[PDB]
Symmetry: C2
Subunit: 215 residues, 2 copies
Amino acid sequence: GYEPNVDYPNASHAGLYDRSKQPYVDTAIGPKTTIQFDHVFIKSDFKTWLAHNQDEAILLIRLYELGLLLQGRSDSFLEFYNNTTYITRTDSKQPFLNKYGKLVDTTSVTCLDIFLSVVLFALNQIDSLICDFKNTPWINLSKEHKKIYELVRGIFYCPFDANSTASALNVNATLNAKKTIELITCGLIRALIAYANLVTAFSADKTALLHEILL
Amino acid sequence: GYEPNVDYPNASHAGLYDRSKQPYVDTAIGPKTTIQFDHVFIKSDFKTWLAHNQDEAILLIRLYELGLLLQGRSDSFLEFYNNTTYITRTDSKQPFLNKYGKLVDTTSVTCLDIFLSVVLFALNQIDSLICDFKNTPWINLSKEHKKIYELVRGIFYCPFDANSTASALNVNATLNAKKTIELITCGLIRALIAYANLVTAFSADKTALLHEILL
Ligand SMILES: [Ca+2]
Ligand SMILES: [Ca+2]
């Protein structure tokens, strides 16, 4: 287990002993790259994942917002888009980019536990909805899943004889309902693979904390 | 935050102040219900999940075995079914039930970190394979994914004119390949939702440990 380059990464970067695509960022220390428990800090795998996977992080942040609404956290939800500053359009996901930045700035394990718990709550809700939708070929949803269905929906012609369109809707109503579930399932898979990796990084970070706070 | 019943669960069970389906199991203390770091023990959400979700736990154990093979852990793999005792068939999943029991008996955070890391490794492999399979309508897989495909496959007629069958295979070869991916995707979704919940329970257990080992 002897490798001087791994023990001295800045020297490894300086002598070009490695192939890092963004040299020296791996040694930057601040709130954006660490987490802490009881003011004991570690360089965080969780924070590295957020920075390398911004796009997928935004998806999870969008699921956090859904979790708030499903949990009844009214104020947190209704104020989720405040303080954006611009009177014009910017990035289509501007409010979630802003929250992303504040998530990266969060260092306390306590606060980060809350984030992941709400995201998982939303992920479990969506999984439960899809299972209910698909438990019979005839579509029938519980009162609670009918609600989830519309929330996930919003949160995220016969030119030869137009008259025939009207009667084609009865067929196209079911098609639209199923398409929505197929798209929801696609997003759920992507969100789950991202969450699985993010929370394992967080769990490994906690092991490092457990080792550090021992003495 | 005053609720005498939550502070005294055994008394709550005795007076029938709750509706637990298996009263008193929630206060049983042993290796099967705890985890430890540095010989500091906590009652484990992780262990409760395994006990409540045995079926899904076995699926994750099967993915652990796949991860071993993909990581080159030869001995661990080739000995994975030893010490079953019976010369006759028992439960179809007998060796995985045996490993399940030993997983429940494992208390060290260190050992449990290894289990989840290998399972995630297999989950990421399968996700990467599916993405490669579906990146073009014409099926073409990397040399490494061709391998994963067969491993996941194994680890887990025209009666009016039989002659026409032969020429129907060219169509049915692609159909069989796609069916396999659809089934793999179904299992991946189920495994991911289970892993997401299990590792969040594990992460919450580590927070409790962090609180306890402070003093
Ligand atoms: Ca239903
Ligand atoms: Ca391909």
